Design a protein around this ligand. Structure first.
Ligand SMILES: NC(=O)c1ccc[n+]([C@@H]2O[C@H](COP(=O)([O-])OP(=O)(O)OC[C@H]3O[C@@H](n4cnc5c(N)ncnc54)[C@H](OP(=O)(O)O)[C@@H]3O)[C@@H](O)[C@H]2O)c1
Ligand SMILES: COc1ccc2c(C(=S)N(C)CC(=O)O)cccc2c1C(F)(F)F
Length: 313
């Protein structure tokens, strides 16, 4: 399978990237270093992850060491919810750039469609526990994203966790200058996303699948939750192909023309997860994996359900 997908900004994006959410800061520099060494060229980052400085140390070391050139890396970050205001976007981007040690990002995403009240807290809550929104119109946040393109700070802009109607809203934005290049969404056999994916694809927006392994390290895992990695049916497909369950889980989105960003800080897994370009799931496997859909989300984030732009109703 070809390793990159063409975006609607004319640039090519690696279909496999390394996720960094929950990667401990004292481990993520080595994780990114190992990933680059084993072939990853796409790193998925975010300011809210609190580890971009340490990601950046790895990127800069690999650039300085001559292991990779900047043009070959595809570095993604995301505008956190507390920075949706147009006057905050450039500084948020520039802080990410400064921490990642970059002069530009390949892709900068609106992390969530939900703007949160600006301030030092990333997760501002009221006394009762509800997310405190900001009044910013995502179309204005989008225009601020467009300005980053026009200032040279980012090569592409996109969105994340936008539902079908939210994507449509950006696409229908009066005066839209740049279409989103990417919509990054949760996607795996328990959350197959057929409708959203087809819509985005039909519009020339590339979809990135997050939590493709079902995020077993998510902080809110419960015993009753289904477990992709432990699902006998998926294990059986893996066994049939002589691959690990994780490898099946990564290959699945790739064959749907998605980008996929499994996270690990374990060197052996980082390498395992990249070894997915050498086998193919059958049409029957694909259809069978699709059949496991149960609309189950790692990132359900019920604490945000009353936000006006909460995307998962
Ligand atoms: N845009 C968004 O809103 C959003 C939300 C969620 C995620 N994301 C992005 O998507 C990335 C991936 O999602 P995720 O971090 O939620 O979870 P994930 O990639 O589905 O799963 C990560 C977990 O799987 C383990 N793991 C990795 N490879 C494995 C393998 N081969 N065998 C067994 N276990 C393995 C990891 O352990 P170790 O690390 O200990 O090896 C970690 O516990 C994130 O890191 C982030 O970059 C974005
Ligand atoms: C939009 O709302 C979000 C978004 C993300 C989170 C996360 C994060 S940082 N993730 C799920 C990872 C990610 O968004 O990439 C953790 C805890 C609560 C969140 C919330 C929450 F609202 F629940 F506070």
């Amino acid at each position: 399978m070809a390793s990159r997908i063409l975006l609607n900004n004319g640039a090519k994006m690696p279909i496999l990237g390394l996720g960094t959410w929950k990667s401990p800061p004292g481990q993520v520099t080595e994780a990114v270093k190992v990933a680059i060494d084993v072939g990853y060229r796409h790193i998925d980052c975010a300011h809210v992850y609190q580890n971009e400085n340490e990601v950046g140390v790895a990127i800069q070391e690999k650039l300085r060491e001559q292991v990779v050139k900047r043009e070959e890396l595809f570095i993604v970050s995301k505008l956190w919810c507390t920075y949706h205001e147009k006057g905050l976007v450039k500084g948020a981007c520039q802080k990410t750039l400064s921490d990642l040690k970059l002069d530009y990002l390949d892709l900068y995403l609106i992390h969530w469609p939900t703007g949160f009240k600006p301030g030092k807290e990333f997760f501002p809550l009221d006394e009762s526990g509800n997310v405190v929104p900001s009044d910013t119109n995502i179309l204005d946040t989008w225009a601020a994203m467009e300005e980053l393109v026009d200032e040279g700070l980012v090569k592409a802009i996109g969105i994340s966790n936008f539902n079908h109607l939210q994507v449509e809203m950006i696409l229908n934005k009066p005066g839209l200058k740049y279409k989103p290049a990417v919509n990054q969404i949760e996607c795996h056999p328990y959350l197959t996303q057929e409708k959203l994916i087809q819509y985005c694809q039909s519009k020339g927006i590339v979809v990135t699948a997050y939590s493709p392994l079902g995020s077993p390290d998510r902080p809110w895992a419960k015993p009753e939750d289904p477990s992709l990695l432990e699902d006998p049916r998926i294990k059986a497909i893996a066994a049939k192909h002589n691959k690990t369950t994780a490898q099946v889980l990564i290959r699945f989105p790739m064959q749907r023309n998605l980008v996929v960003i499994p996270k690990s800080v374990t060197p052996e897994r980082i390498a395992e997860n990249f070894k997915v370009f050498d086998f193919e799931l059958s049409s029957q496997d694909m259809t069978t994996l699709l059949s496991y859909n149960r609309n189950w989300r790692v990132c359900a984030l019920l604490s945000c359900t009353s936000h006006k732009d909460y995307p998962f109703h």
